[PDB]
Automatic annotation (TrEMBL), chain A:
Annotated protein name in UniProt: Transcriptional regulator of oxidative stress OxyR
GO molecular function: DNA binding; DNA-binding transcription factor activity
Protein family membership: Belongs to the LysR transcriptional regulatory family.
Domain of life where this protein originates: Bacteria
Organism: Shewanella oneidensis (strain ATCC 700550 / JCM 31522 / CIP 106686 / LMG 19005 / NCIMB 14063 / MR-1)
Length: 207, 203
């Protein structure tokens, strides 16, 4: 029964595009009798889906509200800020130097907006472009068009989201500028061995 | 004032990462006094925002429900089926079950690819229910199935640093139309036609 059967897995669109294929291919090779029924959605709808019984496991970015659930941290990944290679000004980043609507952020339903704001210490909301984005690939294209800057997760950079771009990587304002990756499941699960195995595989996948 | 002032423009996630940056770049170079207040969202939510006044202009497809609005077609982009480089060889029902990767019905590209490629067998669809074509590209590059892709994604380099090859899907009209949608009672007729010509030249 462990590592066998149908498991309905949820993963947020800031994690799934550059982790999920390696998660699924390894489980196909090592556990071919386990069928992962995936779903890509944002955090609140994913936790709700776990509440209704729609899903059994969620791959989330950890600092969210997981009340009534069990949550296991499986890794960290830092934040970076990207600019076209031609406006590199100063490495210790002052947010007040930047022009007015020049920091692109996803719609606030994506947890990466709040995580990047709190972790990289963005205090001036006037610095935030009024783009209501949903894809970080769109923002990478916007920054590559010299239209501003954005925060990128490290796991996006390591999978070549900056390929075919003139973007460069900077270190954001410090004081723990990272994001926790974690696994979420119901407290009444009967598949704790499977979820701990998936967590160990994901943690090892987060190099 | 044509190309001056605030314009609230919405774009679907299956078009935006391949055209929106170039649209905004050319607009702020040729018309620097027009501010594009942008939004990425799916077709029904963009239509709801257009009807309630939250947005003024939408970049969508043509074959969606645009009752009570004005649609202008600005071009086409073909549908192409992409597969891993090792896995190759009119594309009939040879494919196994749960193999075609499709986005949720929330995104119009699913219905567009289904109707334009004559996909009548749902059993060949993998039950992913995705939202991002880049995730599906990563899944196909891991030898996990097929997916449909718009030509504008391939032109923007979505197959770069992958091992995917392009195949012609079995459709009589294997393409998707692109269009601009706005309220019929608008006064910015010249601005919207200008942006439509701009997008049409870009496509």
């Amino acid at each position: 029964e462990p590592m066998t059967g149908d498991i309905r897995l949820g993963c947020i669109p800031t994690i799934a595009p550059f982790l999920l294929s390696r998660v699924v291919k390894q489980c196909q090779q090592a556990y071919p009798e386990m069928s992962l029924l995936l779903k890509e959605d944002t955090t609140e709808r994913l936790l709700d889906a776990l509440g209704k019984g729609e899903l059994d496991l969620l791959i989330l970015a950890l600092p969210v509200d997981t009340s009534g659930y069990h949550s296991m941290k499986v890794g960290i990944d830092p934040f970076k800020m990207v600019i076209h290679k031609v406006g590199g000004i100063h490495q210790p980043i002052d947010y007040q130097t930047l022009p007015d609507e020049s920091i692109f952020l996803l719609q606030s339903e994506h947890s990466i907006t709040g995580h990047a704001i709190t972790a990289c210490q963005l205090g001036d909301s006037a610095k935030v472009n009024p783009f209501a984005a949903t894809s970080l690939h769109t923002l990478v294209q916007m920054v590559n068009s010299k239209l501003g800057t954005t925060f990128l997760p490290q796991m996006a950079i390591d999978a070549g989201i900056l390929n075919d771009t003139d973007l460069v990587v900077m270190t954001p304002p410090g004081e723990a500028p990272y994001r926790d990756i974690g696994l979420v499941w119901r407290q009444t699960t009967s598949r704790i061995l499977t979820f701990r195995t998936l967590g160990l595989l994901i943690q090892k996948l987060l190099t």
